[PDB]
Design a protein around this ligand. Structure first.
Ligand SMILES: Nc1ncnc2c1ncn2[C@@H]1O[C@H](COP(=O)(O)OP(=O)(O)OP(O)(O)=S)[C@@H](O)[C@H]1O
Ligand SMILES: Nc1ncnc2c1ncn2[C@@H]1O[C@H](COP(=O)(O)OP(=O)(O)OP(O)(O)=S)[C@@H](O)[C@H]1O
Ligand SMILES: [Mg+2]
Ligand SMILES: [Mg+2]
Lengths: 333, 278
DNA sequence: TTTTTTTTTTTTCGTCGCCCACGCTTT
DNA sequence: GTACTTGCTTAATTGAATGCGTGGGCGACGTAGGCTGACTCGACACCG
DNA sequence: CGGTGTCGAGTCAGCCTATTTTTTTTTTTTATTCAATTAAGCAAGTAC
């Protein structure tokens, strides 16, 4: 009697809404397959575990920030490389004007299929993101530094001229327009960002990022990448020891961190991670500085152990399959 | 929260604004009420909602294209008299149609403020007649060229401040750790406007990731405050019996002694909730 | 029974949006 | 074996890490018309 | 006989057309990690 009139008035309003605005304009959340979270590999296996869902979410915005020469571009090109290996189309908006296409090829990016723009203004760069997002043909877009997205008024102006909150305003407007378009297209958007200092502050952290407050809110994931040491062959510095902290996560629990090696010319050391993950999950035994798999001594030191797993791709397939089985927190299906 | 009214929840990024609204909807669904979620931000995970105790199969969801579409679905559902709670996730993401059709860089002076002002006029009356709660979530922005005031603002202009019957300011104030593993957030809500009762009271609670609000953690702190639980440094004791060392052990005790929990809840309600139910 | 003639005068506002960036030893 | 004093365990509380000092703006339309420049088009004068 | 350059007519996007005011406000702010330090309960050591 009471419950019956409500069910009818609901059905009528759902009819009236779907009439006015189109068919999927309102529905029950259990029946919406568009609203399910789908991920893409980062290249790093330690980072796929730290993110909890097994990688970066499609249809969302992601921010990567950090200090100078910390691996922000290199990480972002390993995401594209792994995406192109699954027949996805990718775009690089290079606002910093500093992409070396030979390095991209050495990291395993298919140069010949990667779309690239070196745009004149910030407004031009963000209009090309909206055009590619609406198309539904591109799967991953990267925007290298938002620090470098100069508004048109600032490019036509003189050095010294004040433009109060202009880049902030442009980013606020861009997120409003993009968020919805990226979700309909199932397109991933990765913003790279530089660090700056905030002055006349209390005792917070003095580090900021460029481009205002909008992108913090709209980002589904935020990563903070840092160089924490050197990788040496005696004298020759051959790479960087790198730490990534998940500073915001809406698809799984945050404040997990990943540690891996970037080697100059190859990129992220995949077999290096697989050792450390093998040790942690008691599939590899560490006796001081001696690594042992099923009794058989694979090597002495991490480099020799890594070199062994290179030579035995059956053993490396076996351990990868096992670690994936165990340690992934939220496997989708 | 008052039925037939408008509520505003604002705060910084990942402070617990969406989590809190989903625990309201979960509670309302357990009293057989119908709820709706307008997701203008395009960032709801249905599996997280289910873990917080929402019935996913009876929760109406809209991912609207424009701000005017979003606010016309709110007006349609309000007039129906069928829906009891509506949540609109970010006001900041309610983009007007001129701005969507336009180019990036185009100025639309006071367009979103005007849209919001108009919506408040049309909604206020329809919600009261239907006895429908409307919760707006808002993001923070910064004012520039200001000395008189604090520099924090909210998006969408000045209408919503005036029409809101309750305004909540939610902030993360620390971590919850199991030694090393950060397992949750320590959270503070200030009641910044209130027409239903006296304002400026605050609430402190824990959000535990994949669980939601820590009920038993609050019940410990309220016990201590109302003298029903005895605290000695870091030692919590109910009627002599040492129920644990630290807040986490005490919380784990009240989980595995559910009769004691119901007895303490009943007394805390009797004392501090001075609006007895029908 | 015969046959139409010719215009007159305004009324009222509605609404914000956005940060940006260190500088420097002292014995 | 039971009663009295101290060490350690685990947790939470409060202080301190600090050093002090700021100034900059610009954008429109619900609704209108006339002028100006720069753009486009298609055909003929001239040249190969 | 076709291609290049020039001529004239027609059309799209931007912009410019001109007052005020007497000259205001806030009620307070945001925030963060590491260390020293302290205090009560259980177990260890001591005493009857
Ligand atoms: N073309 C290259 N060849 C060899 N090593 C490189 C090359 N480009 C970058 N690297 C190294 O890889 C590491 C990370 O470099 P990036 O990935 O460019 O860092 P980044 O975070 O983009 O910082 P920025 O761009 O300069 S603003 C650094 O140690 C670089 O020197
Ligand atoms: N799907 C999830 N799984 C586990 N934890 C989550 C998930 N979603 C959010 N959280 C955490 O719960 C806390 C509050 O998250 P939210 O309630 O989404 O915050 P918010 O106030 O909506 O701010 P925003 O939406 O990012 S603009 C944060 O520490 C989140 O990282
Ligand atoms: Mg770079
Ligand atoms: Mg939210």
């Amino acid at each position: 009697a009471i419950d019956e009139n409500k069910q009818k008035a609901l059905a009528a309003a759902l009819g009236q809404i779907e009439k006015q605005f189109g068919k999927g304009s309102i529905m029950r959340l259990g029946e919406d397959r568009s609203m399910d979270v789908e991920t893409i590999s980062t290249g790093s296996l330690s980072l796929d575990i730290a993110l909890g869902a097994g990688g970066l979410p499609m249809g969302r915005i992601v921010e990567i920030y950090g200090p100078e020469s910390s691996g922000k571009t290199t990480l972002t090109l390993q995401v594209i490389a792994a995406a192109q290996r699954e027949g996805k189309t990718c775009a690089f908006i290079d606002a910093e004007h500093a992409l070396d296409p030979i390095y991209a090829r050495k990291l395993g990016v298919d140069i010949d299929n990667l779309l690239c723009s070196q745009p004149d203004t910030g407004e031009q760069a963000l209009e090309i993101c909206d055009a590619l997002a609406r198309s539904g043909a591109v799967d991953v877009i990267v925007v290298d530094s938002v620090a470098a997205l100069t508004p048109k008024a600032e490019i036509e102006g003189e050095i010294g001229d004040s433009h109060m909150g202009l880049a902030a305003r442009m980013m606020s407007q861009a997120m409003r327009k993009l968020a919805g378009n990226l979700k309909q297209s199932n397109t991933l958007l990765i913003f790279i960002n530089q660090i700056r200092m905030k002055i006349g502050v209390m005792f917070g952290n003095p580090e900021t990022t460029t481009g205002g407050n909008a992108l913090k809110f709209y980002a589904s994931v935020r990563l903070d990448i840092r160089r924490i040491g050197a990788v040496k062959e005696g004298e020759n510095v051959v790479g960087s020891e790198t730490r990534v902290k998940v500073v915001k996560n809406k698809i799984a629990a945050p404040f997990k961190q990943a540690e891996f090696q970037i080697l100059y010319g190859e990129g992220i050391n995949f077999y290096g991670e697989l050792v450390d993950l093998g040790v942690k999950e008691k599939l590899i035994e560490k006796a001081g500085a001696w690594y042992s798999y099923k009794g058989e001594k694979i090597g002495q030191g991490k480099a020799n152990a890594t070199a062994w797993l290179k030579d035995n791709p059956e053993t490396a397939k076996e351990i990868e399959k096992k670690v994936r089985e165990l340690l992934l927190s939220n496997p989708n299906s």
